[PDB]
Paper text:
To better understand the role of the ClbP TMD in enzymatic function, we determined the crystal structure of full-length ClbP embedded in a lipid mesophase. Seeking structures in the presence of substrate analogs, we initially focused on the catalytically inactive S95A variant. Early S95A crystals yielded electron density maps that clearly showed the position of individual transmembrane helices, although their resolution was insufficient to assign the registry or helix connectivity pattern. To overcome this challenge, we mutated non-conserved TMD positions to methionine—L454M and I478M—and used anomalous diffraction data from selenomethionine-substituted crystals to locate these sequence markers in electron density maps. We obtained two high-resolution structures of S95A-L454M-I478M: selenomethionine-substituted ClbP and methionine-containing ClbP bound to a product analog. The resulting high-quality maps allowed us to fully model the TMD helices and unambiguously assign their registry. The two structures are nearly identical (root mean squared deviation (RMSD) = 0.15 Å over the Cα carbons of residues 38–414 and 431–491), except for the extent to which the TMD’s intracellular loops are modeled; we base our analysis below on the higher-resolution product-bound structure. We initially crystallized S95A-L454M-I478M in a precipitant solution supplemented with compound 1 and obtained a 2.7-Å structure that suggested that monoolein, the crystallization lipid, was bound at the active site. In our model, the headgroup of monoolein forms polar interactions with active site residues S188 and H257. The chemical similarity to myristoyl-d-asparagine suggests that monoolein acts as a substrate mimic.
Numbering used by the authors:
A (entry chain A), B (entry chain A): 35 to 414, 430 to 495
Write the structure that this text describes.
């Protein structure tokens, strides 16, 4: 009775999938009760394990709507106030502004008005077994007064995870399960505790030399509330369906939802962007309301978009980081709205991969110019010690160069988020520097 | 009775003015009937002529709201249809898509859904005495099907200027005066016919080597409807006031206004931008409605913003191109809304000026290394002919390099829009290339 799914929808999704080169991609579209599912590709490439509805994905920053709804549930029960100071729950977290400890509220983390620098993502995403969030951020220097500006920082929702635990006295996992996944019936959603083996989880990939490459990304327990809630497409359908049909929902959960979609208007807006952030969702009233959020991980990415007044919900899930997946929801919504859609935008990882492939061939053409000029002059101890300084000196500068241009970012961070080809640039430079040393020393020796 | 103007408003405006380094800046703010005026600096620097309320500015792209309201007036009278094909009025303008002539409507130019490439701005802004717009754009190749995408192109409103003339049988100047400036009472607003002398017009400036520099910019008659309507602050106050109080207005002008603020929803929207374009205005419903448009000329810039439901109107006018002036209206509106505002954004011209100043000193440090190494070896006909090839060859490549990287842009365009320092880079390269030739030829001569 429901009829066939839309064939022009399938073309768009396929095309975006082939452009992005993600191995697996799952998409689901609700329009007033009728869903359309699009499940393509492979969750694991080497074993050829198929993308099925049981495949489990990391939700990326779409984790934050879970964390924030829980903050709203605890507020609705009266175990928390939006305006509570964070020090009441995280007594050891001193965060500074202009040298003085600052007053940061719970709202300041909900709405990314905290001033936490971008580098806090490097700190919170590296595993630290016996280390609490408050110690990891202790004595960070904020970028502005709290509440003065919107500035997205993923670590803002790891502070909130830690507040949930102090308030309930329970682990994040238990609070998520007991307050959200059990009562909504999302029987395959979970907040993980680390990288214990999750059956059905897709393998994650990252672009490198033009092909997807298997990448085992870190999964730090303290970072779960901002990045690493795991789920499946049927479950995200139930999640969508809940936000759209809050009638048969208990009154606490319904009220917490209503307050979870209340954007923070007390910030400056740009000339081209008056969109508001709520409790882990962007709120846009233009051709709206249009509630969306994207997920971006080192080896996963995803998006979600809701248009409540027309009962539309879009979610897409993929086991690779691609801007074409962060935009796919806007594409699908353009199609559902006016029957047309833009050409795929670019992708930052893919452009960077190409840049390195060129640079690496450039560094290889240079090695040939040195060795072709070398077998020319060749066919016609203190040397070995001096020539190891040129590569070892460039390799030393390359080592500390990240920490100087951007204080707080290290090579670990670069490797985690960049193309797999990113290591060829230093080593190619190291190899080119070693050979260039031997040439200009053996040319004075003639 | 009205009270003092707001002192925190004055600080913000002063500060933005000193950051941007514009010589003169005029700002006016309406909030339910009470205006606040801020008139600072100098309209002409060499003669020290003061910025007064009589100072006349080029409105930049804020010209388009004038052109488009006239299109709406002619539509309301029934002398034009939104959906009319452009060829009915510009019979010689053939514009191609995929090799075939395309059907472009009047709406396609109103809402920047035409496919006109960015380079059409270079063509329409260079003076051409006996040359009509339709001949200047004849056989351009569009970037996409008409109506398929929003893509801003200033030449879209020069096509509309030409439609107004064919329909009325009158010049653009006469139609603007008779339909808008006379009936609204804006007795100092005019659409110019070229660079005849306009008493009271401010001098225009462009950044160069860190200081503002007097710049005589082109003013091509065919480009007036998109860039070069001239006006004053009292007159822009009357303009604002008209859009906000359409009651005592004749019914044709009131209806044309209502249709002039109707955004075009039939385009794809980005994930972070669902704002619509209307008849020369951006329409944003977020914290709105917020109707705005900025003006950007080579040596002027300006902005306007209206919030009709709260009777707010902001306009700013300056005799230099600065992003800090394109954003000033958003700043003022943030202040009027929540009493706070962001730090000034960057400026593309100023960053580019600094980049060149560094490059030019780099090219000068290189000349010293060559001449210091030269007076060293010096104190211890076929040469003059060979050494003029290195600079003349680099000067040839520099000449055609713009037309190769971006087809349709020439050095004329670069000089018009870039920092005054932009010429030092080629000539410094030319001088460095000539000296480098003499060094490696007189070093083989030893
Ligand atoms: C130079 C590196 C710049 C950006 C890489 C980081 C871009 C993505 C930053 C995280 C975006 C996000 O949504 O957070 C999810 C979570 O933090 C994921 O670990
Ligand atoms: C490389 C040059 C890129 C941009 C320079 C042009 C940026 C501004 C283009 C015009 C913006 C506008 O609003 O149009 C007004 C009028 O066209 C003004 O001549
Ligand atoms: Cl509990
Ligand atoms: Cl445990
Ligand atoms: Cl935003
Ligand atoms: Cl007439
Ligand atoms: Cl004339
Ligand atoms: Cl837009």
């Amino acid at each position: 009775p429901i009829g066939a799914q839309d064939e022009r929808l399938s073309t768009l999704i396929h095309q975006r999938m082939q452009e992005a080169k993600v191995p697996a991609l799952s998409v689901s579209v609700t329009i007033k009760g009728v869903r359309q599912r699009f499940v393509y590709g492979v969750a694991d490439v080497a074993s050829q394990k198929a993308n099925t509805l049981d495949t489990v994905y990391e939700l990326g920053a779409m984790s934050k709507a879970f964390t924030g709804l829980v903050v709203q549930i605890l507020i609705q029960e009266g175990r928390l106030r939006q305006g509570d100071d964070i020090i009441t729950y995280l007594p050891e977290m001193r965060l500074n502004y202009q040298g003085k400890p600052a007053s940061l509220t719970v709202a300041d983390f909900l709405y990314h008005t905290s001033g936490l620098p971008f580098s806090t993502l490097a700190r919170l995403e590296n595993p630290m077994p016996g280390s609490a969030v408050a110690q990891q951020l202790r004595n960070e220097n904020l970028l502005f007064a709290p509440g003065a500006k919107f500035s997205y920082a993923s670590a803002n929702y790891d502070v909130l995870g830690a507040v949930i635990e102090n308030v309930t006295g329970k682990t994040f996992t238990e609070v998520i399960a007991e307050r959200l996944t059990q009562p909504l019936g999302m029987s395959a959603t979970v907040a993980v505790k680390g990288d214990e083996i999750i059956v059905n989880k897709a393998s994650g990939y990252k672009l490198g030399f033009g092909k997807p490459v298997l990448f085992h990304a870190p999964l730090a327990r303290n970072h779960v509330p901002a990045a690493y809630i795991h789920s499946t497409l049927p479950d995200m359908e139930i999640w969508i369906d809940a936000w759209l049909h809050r009638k048969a929902l208990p009154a606490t959960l319904r009220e917490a939802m209503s307050n979870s979609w209340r954007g923070n208007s007390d910030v400056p807006l740009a000339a081209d962007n008056r969109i508001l952030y709520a409790s882990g969702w962007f709120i846009d009233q233009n051709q709206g309301p249009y509630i969306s959020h994207g997920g971006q991980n080192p080896n996963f990415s995803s998006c979600i978009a809701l248009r409540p007044d027309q009962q539309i919900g879009i979610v897409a899930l993929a086991n690779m980081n691609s801007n074409l997946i962060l935009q796919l929801c806007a594409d699908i919504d353009n199609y559902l709205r006016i029957g047309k859609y833009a050409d795929g935008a670019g992708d930052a990882i893919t452009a960077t991969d190409t840049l390195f492939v060129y640079l690496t061939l450039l560094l290889c053409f240079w090695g040939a110019v040195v060795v072709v000029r070398g077998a020319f002059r060749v066919y016609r101890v203190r040397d070995y010690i001096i020539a190891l300084a040129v590569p070892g000196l460039v390799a030393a500068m390359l080592y500390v160069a990240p920490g100087i241009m951007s204080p707080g970012l290290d090579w670990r961070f670069i490797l985690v988020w960049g193309p797999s080809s990113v290591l060829a640039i230093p080593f190619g430079m190291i190899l080119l520097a070693f050979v260039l040393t031997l040439n200009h020393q053996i040319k004075r020796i003639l």
